[PDB]
JSON list of C-alpha atoms in Angstrom, two decimals:
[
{"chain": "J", "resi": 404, "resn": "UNK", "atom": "CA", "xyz": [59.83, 82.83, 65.20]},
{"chain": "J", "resi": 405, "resn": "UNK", "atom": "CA", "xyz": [62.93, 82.73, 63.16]},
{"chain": "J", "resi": 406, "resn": "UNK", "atom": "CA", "xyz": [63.15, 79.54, 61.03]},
{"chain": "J", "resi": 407, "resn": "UNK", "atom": "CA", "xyz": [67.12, 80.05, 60.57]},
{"chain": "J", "resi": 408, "resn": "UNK", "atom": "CA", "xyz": [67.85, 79.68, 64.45]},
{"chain": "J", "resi": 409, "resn": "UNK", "atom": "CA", "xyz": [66.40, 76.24, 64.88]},
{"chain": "J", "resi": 410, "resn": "UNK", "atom": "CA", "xyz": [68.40, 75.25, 61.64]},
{"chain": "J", "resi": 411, "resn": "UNK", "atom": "CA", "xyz": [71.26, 77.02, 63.15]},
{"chain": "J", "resi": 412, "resn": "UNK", "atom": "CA", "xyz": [71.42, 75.15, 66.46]},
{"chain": "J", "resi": 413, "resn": "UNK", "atom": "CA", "xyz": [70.63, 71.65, 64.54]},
{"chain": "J", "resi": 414, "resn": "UNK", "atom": "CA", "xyz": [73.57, 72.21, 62.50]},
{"chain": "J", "resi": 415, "resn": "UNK", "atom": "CA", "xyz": [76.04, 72.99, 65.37]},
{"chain": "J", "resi": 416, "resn": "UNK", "atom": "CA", "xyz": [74.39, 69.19, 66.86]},
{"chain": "J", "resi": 417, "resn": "UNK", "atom": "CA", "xyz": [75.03, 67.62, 63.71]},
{"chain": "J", "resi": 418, "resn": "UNK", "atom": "CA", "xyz": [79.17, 68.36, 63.24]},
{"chain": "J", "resi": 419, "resn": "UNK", "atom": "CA", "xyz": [79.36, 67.00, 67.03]},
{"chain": "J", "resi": 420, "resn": "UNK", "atom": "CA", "xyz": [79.02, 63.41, 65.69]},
{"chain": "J", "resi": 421, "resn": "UNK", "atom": "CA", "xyz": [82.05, 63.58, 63.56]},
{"chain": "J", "resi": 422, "resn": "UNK", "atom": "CA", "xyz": [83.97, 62.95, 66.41]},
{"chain": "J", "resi": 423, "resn": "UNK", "atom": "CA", "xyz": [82.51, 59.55, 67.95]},
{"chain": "J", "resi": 424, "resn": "UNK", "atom": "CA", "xyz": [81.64, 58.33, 63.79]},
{"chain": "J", "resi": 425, "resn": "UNK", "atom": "CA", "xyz": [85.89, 58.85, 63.33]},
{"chain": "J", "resi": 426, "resn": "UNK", "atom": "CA", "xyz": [86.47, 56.80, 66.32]},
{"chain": "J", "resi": 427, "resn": "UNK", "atom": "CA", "xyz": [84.27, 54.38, 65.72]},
{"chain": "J", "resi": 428, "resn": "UNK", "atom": "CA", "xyz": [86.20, 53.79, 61.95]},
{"chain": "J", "resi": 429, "resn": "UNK", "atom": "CA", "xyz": [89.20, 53.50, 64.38]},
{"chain": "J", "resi": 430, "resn": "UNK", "atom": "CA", "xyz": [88.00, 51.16, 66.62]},
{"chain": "J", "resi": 431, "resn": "UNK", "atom": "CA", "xyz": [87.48, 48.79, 63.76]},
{"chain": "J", "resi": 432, "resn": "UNK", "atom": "CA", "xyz": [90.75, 49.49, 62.28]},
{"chain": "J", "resi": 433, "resn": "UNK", "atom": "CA", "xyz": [92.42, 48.42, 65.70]},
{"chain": "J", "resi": 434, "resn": "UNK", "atom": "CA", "xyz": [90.53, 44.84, 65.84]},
{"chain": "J", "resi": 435, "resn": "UNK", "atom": "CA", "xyz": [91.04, 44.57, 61.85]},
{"chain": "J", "resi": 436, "resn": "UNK", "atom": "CA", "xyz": [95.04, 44.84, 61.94]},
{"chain": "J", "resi": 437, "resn": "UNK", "atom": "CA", "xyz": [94.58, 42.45, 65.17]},
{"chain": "J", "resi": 438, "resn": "UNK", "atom": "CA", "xyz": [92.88, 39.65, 63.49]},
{"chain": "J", "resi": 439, "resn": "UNK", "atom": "CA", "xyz": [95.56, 39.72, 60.94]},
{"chain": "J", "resi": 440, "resn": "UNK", "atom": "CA", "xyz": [97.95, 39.47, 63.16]},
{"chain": "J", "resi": 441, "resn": "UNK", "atom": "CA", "xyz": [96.59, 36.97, 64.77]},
{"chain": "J", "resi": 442, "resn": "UNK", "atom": "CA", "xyz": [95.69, 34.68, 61.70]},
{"chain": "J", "resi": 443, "resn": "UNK", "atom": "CA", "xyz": [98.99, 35.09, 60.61]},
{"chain": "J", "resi": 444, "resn": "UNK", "atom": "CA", "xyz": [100.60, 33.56, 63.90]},
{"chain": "J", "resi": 445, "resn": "UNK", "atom": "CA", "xyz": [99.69, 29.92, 61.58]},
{"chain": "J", "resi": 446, "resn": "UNK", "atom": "CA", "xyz": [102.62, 31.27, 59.12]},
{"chain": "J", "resi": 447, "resn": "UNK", "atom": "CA", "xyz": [105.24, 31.80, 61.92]},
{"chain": "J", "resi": 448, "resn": "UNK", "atom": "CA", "xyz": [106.89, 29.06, 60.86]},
{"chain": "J", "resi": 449, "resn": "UNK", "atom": "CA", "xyz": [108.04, 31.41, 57.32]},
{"chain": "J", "resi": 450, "resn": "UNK", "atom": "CA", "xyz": [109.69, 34.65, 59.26]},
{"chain": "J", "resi": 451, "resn": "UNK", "atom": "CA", "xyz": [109.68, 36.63, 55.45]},
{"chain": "J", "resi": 452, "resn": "UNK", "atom": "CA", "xyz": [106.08, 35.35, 54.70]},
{"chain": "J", "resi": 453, "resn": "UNK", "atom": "CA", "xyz": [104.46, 36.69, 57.74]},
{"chain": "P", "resi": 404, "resn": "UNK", "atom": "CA", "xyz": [55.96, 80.81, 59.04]},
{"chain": "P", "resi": 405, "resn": "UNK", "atom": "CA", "xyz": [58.43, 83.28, 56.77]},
{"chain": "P", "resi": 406, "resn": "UNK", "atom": "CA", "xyz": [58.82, 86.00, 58.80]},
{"chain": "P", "resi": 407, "resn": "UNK", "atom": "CA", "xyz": [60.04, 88.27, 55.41]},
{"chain": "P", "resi": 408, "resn": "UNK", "atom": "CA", "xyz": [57.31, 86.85, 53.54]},
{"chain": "P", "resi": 409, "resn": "UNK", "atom": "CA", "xyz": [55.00, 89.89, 55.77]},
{"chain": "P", "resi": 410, "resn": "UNK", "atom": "CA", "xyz": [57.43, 92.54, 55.81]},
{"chain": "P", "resi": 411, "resn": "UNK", "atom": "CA", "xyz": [56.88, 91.89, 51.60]},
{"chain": "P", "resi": 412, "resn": "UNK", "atom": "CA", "xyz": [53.56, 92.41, 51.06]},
{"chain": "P", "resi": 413, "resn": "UNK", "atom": "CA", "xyz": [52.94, 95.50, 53.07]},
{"chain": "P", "resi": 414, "resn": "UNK", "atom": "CA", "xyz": [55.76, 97.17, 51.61]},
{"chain": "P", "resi": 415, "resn": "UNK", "atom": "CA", "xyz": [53.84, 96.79, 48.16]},
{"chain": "P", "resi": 416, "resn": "UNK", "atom": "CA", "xyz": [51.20, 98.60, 49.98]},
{"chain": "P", "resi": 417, "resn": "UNK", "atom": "CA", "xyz": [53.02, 101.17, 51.32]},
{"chain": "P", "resi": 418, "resn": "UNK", "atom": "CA", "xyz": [54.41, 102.01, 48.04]},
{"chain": "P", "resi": 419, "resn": "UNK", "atom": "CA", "xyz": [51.10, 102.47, 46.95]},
{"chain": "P", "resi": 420, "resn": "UNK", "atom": "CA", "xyz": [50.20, 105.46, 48.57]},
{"chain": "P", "resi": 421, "resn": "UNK", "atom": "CA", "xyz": [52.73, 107.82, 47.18]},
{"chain": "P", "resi": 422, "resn": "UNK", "atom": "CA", "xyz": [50.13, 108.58, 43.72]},
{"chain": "P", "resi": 423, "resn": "UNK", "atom": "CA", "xyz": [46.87, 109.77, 45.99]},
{"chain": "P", "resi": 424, "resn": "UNK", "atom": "CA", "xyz": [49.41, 111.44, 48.56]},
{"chain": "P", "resi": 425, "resn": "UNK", "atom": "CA", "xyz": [51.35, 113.39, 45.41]},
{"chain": "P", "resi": 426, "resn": "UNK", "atom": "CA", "xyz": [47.72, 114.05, 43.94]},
{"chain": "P", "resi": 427, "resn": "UNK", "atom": "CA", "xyz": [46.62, 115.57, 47.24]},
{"chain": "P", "resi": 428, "resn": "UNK", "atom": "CA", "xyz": [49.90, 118.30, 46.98]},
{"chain": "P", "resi": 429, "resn": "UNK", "atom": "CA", "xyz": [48.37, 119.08, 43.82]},
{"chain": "P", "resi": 430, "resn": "UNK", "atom": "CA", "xyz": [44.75, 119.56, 44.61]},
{"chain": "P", "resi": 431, "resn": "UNK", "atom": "CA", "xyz": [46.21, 121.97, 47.74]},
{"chain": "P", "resi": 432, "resn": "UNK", "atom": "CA", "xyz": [48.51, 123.78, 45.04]},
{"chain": "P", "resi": 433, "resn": "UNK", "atom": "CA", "xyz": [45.25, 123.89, 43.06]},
{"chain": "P", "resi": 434, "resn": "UNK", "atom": "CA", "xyz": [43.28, 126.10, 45.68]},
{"chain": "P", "resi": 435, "resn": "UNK", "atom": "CA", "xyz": [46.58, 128.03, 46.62]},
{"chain": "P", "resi": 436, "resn": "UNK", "atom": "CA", "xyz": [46.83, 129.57, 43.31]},
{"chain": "P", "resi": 437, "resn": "UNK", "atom": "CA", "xyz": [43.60, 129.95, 42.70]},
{"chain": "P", "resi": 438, "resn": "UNK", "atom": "CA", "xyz": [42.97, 131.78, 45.80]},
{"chain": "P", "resi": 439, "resn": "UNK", "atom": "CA", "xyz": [46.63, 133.89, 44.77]},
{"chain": "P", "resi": 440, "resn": "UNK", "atom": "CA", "xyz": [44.01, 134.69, 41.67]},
{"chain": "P", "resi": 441, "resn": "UNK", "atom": "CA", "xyz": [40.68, 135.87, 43.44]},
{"chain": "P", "resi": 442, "resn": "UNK", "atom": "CA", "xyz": [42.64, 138.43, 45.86]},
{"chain": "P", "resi": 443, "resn": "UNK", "atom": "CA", "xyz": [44.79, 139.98, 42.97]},
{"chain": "P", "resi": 444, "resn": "UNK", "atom": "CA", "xyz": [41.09, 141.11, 41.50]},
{"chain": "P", "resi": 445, "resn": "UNK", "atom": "CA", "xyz": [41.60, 143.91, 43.94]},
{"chain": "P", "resi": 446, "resn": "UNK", "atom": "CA", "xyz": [44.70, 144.75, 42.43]},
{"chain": "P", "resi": 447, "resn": "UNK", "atom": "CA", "xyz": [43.54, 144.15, 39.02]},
{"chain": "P", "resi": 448, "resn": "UNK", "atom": "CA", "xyz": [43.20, 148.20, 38.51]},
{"chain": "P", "resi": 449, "resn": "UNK", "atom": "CA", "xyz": [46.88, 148.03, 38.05]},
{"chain": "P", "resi": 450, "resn": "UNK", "atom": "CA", "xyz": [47.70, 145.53, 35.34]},
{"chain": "P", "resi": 451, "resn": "UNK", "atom": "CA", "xyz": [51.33, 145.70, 35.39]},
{"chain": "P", "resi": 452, "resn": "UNK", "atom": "CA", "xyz": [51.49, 145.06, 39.87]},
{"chain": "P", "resi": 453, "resn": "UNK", "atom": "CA", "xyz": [48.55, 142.49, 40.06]}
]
């Protein structure tokens, strides 16, 4: 049985998780820039600080 | 298991039977023109033909 063809399949598997690992690095930008924003809600009070 | 790794080997083997399979041509080219020889002793009263 050909060795290559499991390898084969594996690696078309194995590029489908670029997809939902990208995302995930989104995810965390989205609630990173959101706890800055909303730390930065205590320096309101300086319009060109914040 | 490598599927090539088979195919390998027995071509080596193959190979191998090209010297007694020549060797056989010769030993029939052997008894062809020695058997050209023993009927041209009925010709041999004419040197010059036979």
């Amino acid at each position: 049985t050909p060795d290559m063809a499991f390898e084969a399949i594996v690696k078309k598997q194995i590029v489908k998780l670029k997809g939902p690992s990208l995302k995930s690095v989104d995810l965390v930008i989205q609630e990173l820039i959101n706890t800055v924003k909303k730390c930065t809600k205590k320096l309101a009070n300086f319009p060109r600080l914040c």
